[PDB]
Enzyme design. Structure first.
Site, PDB file in Angstrom:
ATOM      1  N   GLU A   1       3.579   8.578  -4.426  1.00 29.96           N
ATOM      2  CA  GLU A   1       4.446   8.172  -3.312  1.00 29.96           C
ATOM      3  C   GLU A   1       5.546   7.259  -3.871  1.00 29.96           C
ATOM      4  O   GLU A   1       6.365   6.740  -3.119  1.00 29.96           O
ATOM      5  CB  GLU A   1       3.679   7.515  -2.155  1.00 29.96           C
ATOM      6  CG  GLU A   1       2.873   8.482  -1.297  1.00 29.96           C
ATOM      7  CD  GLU A   1       2.070   7.874  -0.159  1.00 29.96           C
ATOM      8  OE1 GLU A   1       2.135   6.642   0.058  1.00 29.96           O
ATOM      9  OE2 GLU A   1       1.350   8.642   0.515  1.00 29.96           O
TER      10      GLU A   1
ATOM     11  N   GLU B   1       0.892  -1.145   0.000  1.00 30.28           N
ATOM     12  CA  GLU B   1       0.000   0.000   0.000  1.00 30.28           C
ATOM     13  C   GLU B   1       0.936   1.201   0.000  1.00 30.28           C
ATOM     14  O   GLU B   1       1.192   1.818   1.046  1.00 30.28           O
ATOM     15  CB  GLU B   1      -0.952  -0.033   1.203  1.00 30.28           C
ATOM     16  CG  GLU B   1      -2.147   0.896   1.057  1.00 30.28           C
ATOM     17  CD  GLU B   1      -1.815   2.378   1.163  1.00 30.28           C
ATOM     18  OE1 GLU B   1      -1.518   2.979   0.106  1.00 30.28           O
ATOM     19  OE2 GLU B   1      -1.721   2.902   2.297  1.00 30.28           O
TER      20      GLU B   1
HETATM   21  N1  0XU Z   1      11.353   1.206  -0.877  1.00 32.23           N
HETATM   22  C1  0XU Z   1      10.659   0.901   0.334  1.00 32.23           C
HETATM   23  N2  0XU Z   1      11.028  -0.191   1.039  1.00 32.23           N
HETATM   24  C2  0XU Z   1      10.373  -0.520   2.181  1.00 32.23           C
HETATM   25  N3  0XU Z   1       9.366   0.158   2.769  1.00 32.23           N
HETATM   26  C3  0XU Z   1       9.048   1.245   2.031  1.00 32.23           C
HETATM   27  C4  0XU Z   1       9.645   1.702   0.850  1.00 32.23           C
HETATM   28  N4  0XU Z   1       9.011   2.865   0.418  1.00 32.23           N
HETATM   29  C5  0XU Z   1       8.060   3.092   1.330  1.00 32.23           C
HETATM   30  N5  0XU Z   1       8.050   2.130   2.310  1.00 32.23           N
HETATM   31  C6  0XU Z   1       7.270   2.066   3.534  1.00 32.23           C
HETATM   32  O1  0XU Z   1       5.994   1.481   3.281  1.00 32.23           O
HETATM   33  C7  0XU Z   1       5.078   2.361   3.808  1.00 32.23           C
HETATM   34  C8  0XU Z   1       3.814   2.274   3.393  1.00 32.23           C
HETATM   35  C9  0XU Z   1       2.634   3.149   3.697  1.00 32.23           C
HETATM   36  N6  0XU Z   1       2.300   3.965   2.505  1.00 32.23           N
HETATM   37  C10 0XU Z   1       1.493   2.260   4.225  1.00 32.23           C
HETATM   38  C11 0XU Z   1       1.840   1.738   5.621  1.00 32.23           C
HETATM   39  C12 0XU Z   1       1.109   0.475   6.106  1.00 32.23           C
HETATM   40  N7  0XU Z   1       1.234  -0.699   5.232  1.00 32.23           N
HETATM   41  C13 0XU Z   1      -0.344   0.714   6.471  1.00 32.23           C
HETATM   42  O2  0XU Z   1      -1.172   0.498   5.402  1.00 32.23           O
HETATM   43  O3  0XU Z   1      -0.740   1.065   7.581  1.00 32.23           O
HETATM   44  C14 0XU Z   1       5.686   3.288   4.813  1.00 32.23           C
HETATM   45  O4  0XU Z   1       5.740   2.601   6.052  1.00 32.23           O
HETATM   46  C15 0XU Z   1       7.091   3.402   4.238  1.00 32.23           C
HETATM   47  O5  0XU Z   1       8.120   3.515   5.211  1.00 32.23           O
END
Ligand code: 0XU
Ligand code: 0XU
Lengths: 8, 318, 303, 307, 8, 318, 8
Positions: free
Chosen positions: F125, F116
């Protein structure tokens, strides 16, 4: 000239 | 630009030094008896318009040794000059590679990697980061030319230069950003306040795992005069190979070499220094995966602000 | 063979004449000198080897297109803006300039000899189409019908006043010089190549900038196929009673198609843009291609 | 007095061409930096891996010659606004490549065409190059007074030319320029290279260009008339436009082949010199105001300040 | 010169 | 920050949709007869504080299927929450990985990658760049959840919002930079001038070699009113799996889902639009190896300047 | 909220 000053 | 490379090429001393360093290296690596069988793999990393390629070939002729050359250049405009030289003059002996040395999948390992990626403060054009990425294609007993470089700093007084930096205030940026960035300048109306002292050193090949090109140095400069501190003059020295060196440090300046003028790190606010006091300066070499920058501060006789924190006014792109 | 020591890298054109000798056109599109050359190979299997040609000559500027004028004449579309006529000597050992007329104001991109063999048509980046008298070495008529670069001009195989033209202005024009307004617009993506059907008088094929080949009949709907992934550079019908259609592209391939435009042969031998194709008049199943990779490939087509 | 250049699309030998052009009396040469027919691929194999030099070396001329005598020209196949995605992508990469080579060479100016209504992506790629490094070079947008579509011969049977007045329609090429420069946000490095045709449009189309940054006027040899002696001359209406352009101190560019074959080439340029010499001499006011044309000044305040 | 650009 | 993740987690609709998408995928990949032998490898890429990890486990329980989970997160602060959850509740079934998904050397290939990484304009993003780098560890027949996403644009009138953007002029930057950047905003006092039209689409896994996430779109909006154009509202839709979707497009808005407010791309100068005229907008998705940005322009009824050229006012860090 | 930060 022509009632002016300054510029560049 | 083409004319920038043309200015580089006007320095006769620099290239004749590189040629002497390659000449000695070839003799140390290939004994007389292996003269006709041993072909040394030479890679010019950051070849520009070809002077180090020509310096390598002259070096191999005077050493009476066999070489296999690769000329690596990331600038495609310079690659045009190199490819026209390769077709017209060099031939098959030279393989021109249009690539960043950090990405190139070399087809063979090198005996010698030759580069001239040095700035006025040695590592300011990012020679450590570039040669670190190229390191994996150098053989286990391989030689890097240059083998080492060291930057030097010296406190200076110049109300003339302080006012010159002051007048560099531009619209749409921090009104004090001009004081948080180095300048290449042929220092003329100034006073050097203490003998240049070594700041940062890099060695190639780098055999300290995970490298860490970040650095922190404290320098204490004795001052024998009443003066006003306005900034730090920066210089460098480099060991091309063994005793073959290049220097812009005033005391050991390579004669007739004009490729590099000194660098100047200004300070925001002038500092009064009394005779017998010590100027203590702190310099940091910082980075992330995108940029490299310097941060600096004076801590004695009085503290200054830390200049360029997080590279807010000046960065060197990776 | 009293010819240039080395031919330029970029092979632009290849044409067999009745006896099976092969005429090559080349330009240097890079390096110091941007010129061209013309070559005759009585042994086509030795091409592009200079030391094994029958004749060779250096032109002042690049060769954008060429064509035979009978058995000994060679008409060239030059970068200089000139349309040139070269001629093989009685010994066929020399290629001598007959005329170099600078009539176009930009590069001459396309050339085509009309039915009689006494007149030709030229197209240019200058947007003009010119009708030439080959004996008097003069332009008979100059036409500014298009609104962009003229991409291709193709003389009717059997009607001396009829030719086709296409351009970057998205027009395909059918010309008949017997008409007061001689051009007529034939009804997407820019047209890039043209070939008249060698048996069917009012039928032609056209290639476009998006890789599509289309079958058109002057009367009327059009049959088409996505043959190439990039621009259709050329279209050449075979000499058979039921001809095959060779198509070449900037996608570096050659395709040989049937009457319904379905693929029968495909070659990926070229490592750069395929520029011309010519069918052998001696062995009808052999098709020769030339490209910017400096290869002269002789394909054995399944017929 | 008159600053003039030669426009060529064929330069077999750079040194020989420059010499011939200088001998003819021209001050500069507008020429291709990459072969105009040398289409390049950046995305698809095998053609993207084409070896050898992509163009001629910078070593062929001195730095001074590149800086002062050469105006670069964008390759004619570069179509950033193509309907074909593949052409659009290869054209963006080729345009950036050619503009970067021009800046590498230190060219004083670079010519780009405005030859259709939609040049949105050409403007985007140009704006992006402008906001990348060295900010000295000039971009000359080659735009005609009359669009090729509006001056084509009335020779297409099923597509007659429009014989009706289209007031705004005949001013179309100005809107091509206007939209382009609006997109590039009035960069001062973006100017007009106005191309003049055999037949001039109505005065309102010509006047539409008043107040525009015209740096060059393009004169094809095909617009020149022939006099009793067989030398190239211009119609009274064309001469009237040359005089207006001379007051703007534009650089004239001579394009096309020699159409006055048995009368030499420098004759076109000799005629421009003749027109330049045979113009009304400036009055007392005009001689006084020379240097102040469009020079913004602060109005004097003799009360608040001591003059 | 001397590894610098710009200025004036 | 912790509270940002806490706000994300307050949306009940989003996660129940992800759970339904994983549930259906597991049933399509493992037949009933393979129920006890087939262990599906599931990777949550960008795990935050663990809701998609919990959604995956609930999905596997309701599908009556066996899963092996990896929870990948680059934020070390969130990694603290994940590691405390792993010890206290999840156990060995979950392997927490503190890494960027683009760098992680996965020890096994995945059957399903769940993420997500979506912004209000879908790809803002950098979900395409992130999932492109993670693609190599997904099996040949592997599934990515989401499978696809599309951004949408609609012209808007709001002198209220135009004035709100206008007041965002800050010191030490371009005085017009506030107009060259998008804003996340719950649009309220405004007029939508034409139906939202699709702008950019991305599909995962990406099977168009060298990918090319750069994009150029021309949109023509019919306008039936006399008005003033002030900017473009941005929305998105996403296919999680098959018919299981999420949307913020007003016409298909997922009911009760508040994770994303629309985005607003302003224009520097207001544009008068007459009834029956067409608004033509041009949008570009641009990048280098360091940053991704958008550039935009209006070309009909009148031209605007190109906004944000070269990312001069706004960039999205890679 | 709604995927945004900052403001006032
Ligand atoms: N290249 C990447 N590798 C790992 N995590 C990442 C990366 N780019 C973004 N993220 C992480 O993934 C994330 C996703 C969020 N947009 C959603 C967070 C979560 N899954 C939720 O739905 O509550 C954030 O926690 C970021 O730190
Ligand atoms: N990572 C890199 N890969 C390849 N070339 C690079 C890289 N970084 C810098 N260079 C090039 O190497 C260069 C080196 C110059 N500092 C010296 C140029 C040249 N060797 C001369 O001494 O005349 C420039 O041409 C840069 O384009």
């Amino acid at each position: 000239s022509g009632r002016g000053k300054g510029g560049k | 630009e083409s004319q920038t490379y043309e200015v580089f090429e006007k320095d006769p001393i620099k290239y004749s030094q590189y040629q002497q360093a390659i000449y000695k290296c070839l003799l140390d690596r290939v004994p007389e008896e292996e003269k006709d069988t041993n072909v040394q793999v030479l890679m010019v990393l950051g070849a520009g318009r070809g002077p180090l390629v020509n310096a390598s070939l002259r070096a191999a002729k005077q050493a009476d040794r066999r070489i296999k050359l690769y000329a690596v250049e990331k600038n495609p405009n310079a690659v045009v000059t190199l490819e026209n030289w390769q077709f017209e003059e060099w031939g098959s002996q030279v393989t021109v590679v249009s690539s960043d040395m950090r990405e190139w999948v070399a087809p063979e390992k090198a005996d010698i990697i030759v580069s001239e990626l040095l700035g006025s403060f040695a590592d300011n054009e990012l020679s450590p980061e570039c040669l670190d990425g190229a390191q994996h294609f150098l053989k286990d007993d391989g030689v890097s030319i240059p083998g080492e470089y060291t930057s030097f700093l010296a406190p200076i007084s110049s109300s003339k230069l302080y006012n010159e930096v002051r007048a560099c205030r531009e619209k749409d940026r921090d009104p004090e950003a001009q004081f948080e960035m180095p300048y290449v300048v042929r220092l003329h109306n100034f006073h050097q306040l203490s003998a240049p002292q070594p700041c940062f050193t890099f060695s190639h090949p780098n055999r300290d795992p995970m490298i860490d090109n970040n650095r922190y140095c404290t320098l204490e400069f004795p001052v024998e005069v009443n003066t006003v501190l306005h900034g730090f003059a920066g210089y460098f020295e480099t060991v091309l190979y063994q005793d073959i060196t290049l220097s812009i440090r005033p005391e050991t300046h390579s004669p007739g070499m004009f490729s590099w003028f000194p660098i100047l790190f200004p300070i925001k606010q002038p500092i009064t220094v009394r005779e017998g006091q010590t100027i203590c300066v702190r310099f940091w070499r910082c980075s992330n995966s995108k940029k490299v920058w310097y941060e600096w501060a004076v801590t004695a006789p009085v503290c200054s602000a830390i200049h360029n924190p997080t590279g807010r006014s000046y960065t060197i792109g990776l | 063979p009293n010819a240039p020591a080395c031919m330029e890298r970029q092979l632009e054109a290849a044409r067999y004449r009745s006896d099976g000798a092969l005429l090559l056109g080349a330009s240097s599109l890079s390096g110091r000198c941007w010129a061209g050359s013309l070559w005759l190979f009585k042994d086509p299997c030795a091409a592009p080897n200079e030391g094994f040609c029958s004749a060779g000559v250096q032109t002042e500027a690049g060769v954008a297109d060429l064509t035979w004028v009978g058995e000994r004449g060679i008409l060239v579309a030059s970068d200089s803006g000139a349309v040139e006529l070269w001629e093989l000597d009685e010994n066929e050992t020399l290629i001598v300039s007959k005329f170099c007329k600078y009539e176009h104001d930009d590069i001459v991109s396309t050339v085509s000899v009309l039915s009689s063999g006494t007149q030709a048509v030229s197209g240019s980046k200058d947007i003009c189409i010119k009708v030439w008298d080959l004996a008097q070495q003069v332009v008979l008529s100059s036409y500014r019908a298009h609104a962009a670069q003229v991409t291709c001009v193709a003389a009717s195989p059997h009607k001396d006043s009829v030719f086709l033209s296409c351009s970057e202005d998205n027009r395909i024009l059918l010309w008949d010089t017997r008409c007061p307004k001689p051009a007529s617009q034939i009804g997407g993506y820019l047209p890039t190549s043209l070939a008249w059907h060698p048996q069917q008088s009012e039928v032609f094929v056209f290639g476009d900038e998006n890789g599509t080949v289309s079958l058109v009949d002057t009367k009327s709907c059009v049959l088409s196929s996505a043959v190439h992934s990039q621009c259709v550079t050329g279209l050449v019908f075979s000499p058979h009673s039921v001809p095959f259609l060779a198509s070449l592209s900037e996608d570096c391939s050659l395709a040989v198609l049937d009457s319904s435009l379905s693929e029968l042969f495909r070659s990926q031998a070229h490592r750069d843009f395929v520029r011309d194709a010519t069918w052998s008049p001696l062995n009808h199943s052999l098709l020769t291609t030339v490209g910017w990779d400096h290869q002269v490939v002789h394909h054995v087509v399944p017929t | 007095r008159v600053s003039s250049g030669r426009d060529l699309n064929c330069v077999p030998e750079i040194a020989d061409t420059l010499g011939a052009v200088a001998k003819q009396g021209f001050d500069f040469l507008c020429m291709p930096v990459f072969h105009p027919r040398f289409k390049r691929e950046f995305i698809q194999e095998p053609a993207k891996n084409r070896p050898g030099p992509q163009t001629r070396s910078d070593l062929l001329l001195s730095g001074r010659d590149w800086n002062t005598l050469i105006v670069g020209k964008l390759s004619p196949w570069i179509r950033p606004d193509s309907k074909v995605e593949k052409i659009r992508r290869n054209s963006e990469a080729a345009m950036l490549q050619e503009l970067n080579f021009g800046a590498y060479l230190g060219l004083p100016a670079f010519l780009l065409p405005l030859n259709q209504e939609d040049n949105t992506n050409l403007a985007r790629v140009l704006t992006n190059h402008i906001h990348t490094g060295h900010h000295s070079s000039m971009f000359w947008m080659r735009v005609p007074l009359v669009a090729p579509e509006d001056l084509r011969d009335d020779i297409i049977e099923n597509a007659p030319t429009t014989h009706t007045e289209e007031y705004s329609g005949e001013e179309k090429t100005w809107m091509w320029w206007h939209n382009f420069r609006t997109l590039c946000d009035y960069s001062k490095r973006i100017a007009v290279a106005l191309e003049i045709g055999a037949d001039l449009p109505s005065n309102h189309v010509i006047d539409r260009w008043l107040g525009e940054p015209i740096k060059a006027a393009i004169l094809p040899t095909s617009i020149f008339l022939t006099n009793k002696k067989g030398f190239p001359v211009l119609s009274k209406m064309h001469q009237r436009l040359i005089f207006r352009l001379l007051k703007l101190e534009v650089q004239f560019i001579i394009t096309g082949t020699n159409h006055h074959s048995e009368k030499e080439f420098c004759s076109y340029l000799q005629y421009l010199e003749y027109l330049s010499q045979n113009r009304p001499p400036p009055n007392a006011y005009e001689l006084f105001a020379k240097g102040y044309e469009d020079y913004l000044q602060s109005p004097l305040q003799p009360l608040m300040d001591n003059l």
